[PDB]
Structures are given as structure tokens and as C-alpha cells.
Amino acid sequence: MSISISYSTTYSGWTVADYLADWSAYFGDVNHRPGQVVDGSNTGGFNPGPFDGSQYALKSTASDAAFIAGGDLHYTLFSNPSHTLWGKLDSIALGDTLTGGASSGGYALDSQEVSFSNLGLDSPIAQGRDGTVHKVVYGLMSGDSSALQGQIDALLKAVDPSLSINSTFDQLAAAGVAHATPAA
């Protein structure tokens, strides 16, 4: 299945690039870096976990913003290549107010704004932090969605050259790629 995008009608006239740029500024930088990682503050979590899961999810420390990365994800922690998130990234869901976790049978967003699915991204452990999956997710954690933007852009252009991250969600819905959900 090719890339599918779900969006609240609230963002119908926003370009994907503007939405993501503004969302990352709103989520901010959790400062997930050497000497600055604090359990339960800026780590996020895996479902099932502890270091691998079908979901990785993280709440903003600056706001109610949160994201859920979906697929088949793995984190190396201290083992070479250290601090690498790798595996399959199938989806990114962006919104407010993270709920759930491993014990609930999954993370969710109370106010999901936008989701990108069927991303088809797959990065091997041996690529380390140069892997696309790593860069996309760490980008989000650190207030820079450029890697995510770049991957969405490539996927959209591969569906049709008239589609890009500078398309509005409505324009992408006109092409059958994006699908509106009610404004909550």
C-alpha cells in the first residue's frame, strides 16, 4: 500500500511542510542528549518495550504535544552502534495528549491531528545513526522535522510528481492520498 495521510479538517488548507514545521516548534526539543536523559521526563517509551516495539511514543516537555512512531522498532542504547533507533517505520501520528502504553495494549493520542501511514521505511542496525528511521524519529524528538519532511516529500513525489510536502492536505486528498477526519 502506498503512503496514506489522515488529517483533521482543521489543517485542510495547511501545507504539509508548514504543519510539520509548526508542529515541531510546538513540540520543541526534549533535550534527549548525553548527560541530559532523565527517566520518565524525556525518554518516551516502547510498546511492548523495554527497547523494542511496534510503537515508540514521546510526550513534549514544553507542551501537550506528542508523537507515536509505529512499525517494528529497536533501540541499541550502549551497544555499538550506540544510541541507534532502527527497524521498520510504518507510521507517524502527531497530536496532543498521549495515553496508554504497553499494559493498555497500545499508545494513543486523545487529540490526533495528523498521521502518515504506509511509509515503508526500513533501516538496518549496521547503518547506525545514519539510518533514515533514526534521523526521522530523533528529528522529531529534538524539534527538527526536516528528516520527516524529506521522507514524506520523496514518498509523495513517487506517487505523483505533482504531490509534495508543499501541497496542502486538501490538495493531497484531491489526489486520493490524504483523507480528512472531523475537527475535534
83 marked ligand binding residue: yes
Burial 39-76 (b: 16+ CB within 10 A, else e): eeebebbbbeeeeebbbbbbbbeeeebbbbbbbebbbb
32 annotated to bind ligand: yes
Whether residue 134 is annotated as binding a ligand: the answer is no
Contact 81, 120 (CB under 8 A): no
Would you say 124 and 173 are in contact if contact means Cβ atoms under 8 Å apart? Answer: no
Residue 75, marked binder:
yes
C-alpha pair distances (Å), 28 with each of 12, 37, 105: 23, 15, 28
What resolution in angstroms does the PDB record give?
A: 1.9
User: 17 Cβ partners below 8 Å, 6+ apart?
Assistant: 149, 165, 166
Angle CA 2–60–65, to nearest 5: 55
33 appears as a binding residue in the annotation: no
Q: Round to whole Å and give the CA distance between 92 and 116.
A: 5
What gap in Å lies between CA 10 and CA 162, rounded to an integer?
23
**Cell (9 digits) for 101:** 502504553
Shortest CA distance to 143 belongs to which of 10, 42, 9, 56? Answer: 42
Position 38: which residue type? V
Ordered DSSP codes for 6-59: EEEGGGTTSBHHHHHHHHHHHH-B---STTT--TTTS--EEEE-SSEEEEEEEE
Domain boundaries, the chain: 1-184
Q: How far apart are CA 93 and CA 13, in angstroms?
A: 19
The Cα 184–Cα 177 span in angstroms is 22
Q: Tell how far CA 163 is from the center of its chain.
A: 20
DSSP assignment of the chain equals: ---EEEEEGGGTTSBHHHHHHHHHHHH-B---STTT--TTTS--EEEE-SSEEEEEEEE-SSSSEEEEEEEEEEE-TTSSSPS-EEEEEEEEEEEEEEEEEGGGTEEEEEEEEEEEE---EEE-GGGGGGSHHHHHHHHHHBT--HHHHHHHHHHHHHH-TT--TTSBHHHHHHTTSEEEE---
Amino acid at residue number 85: L
Rama region for 42: left / alpha / beta (φ>0; ψ in -120 to 50; rest): alpha
CATH code for the structural domain at 1-184: 3.30.1500.10
User: Alpha-carbon distance 20 to 11, whole Å?
Assistant: 11
Ramachandran quadrant class, 28 (left: phi over 0; alpha: psi -120 to 50; beta: rest): left
Is 44 labelled a binding residue? no
Pairing of strands 45-48, 178-181: unpaired
- 105: cell is 495494549
Q: Whole-angstrom Cα distance, residue 3 to residue 145?
A: 18
- Residues 178, 6: contact at Cβ < 8 Å? yes
CA distance 170 to 28: 26
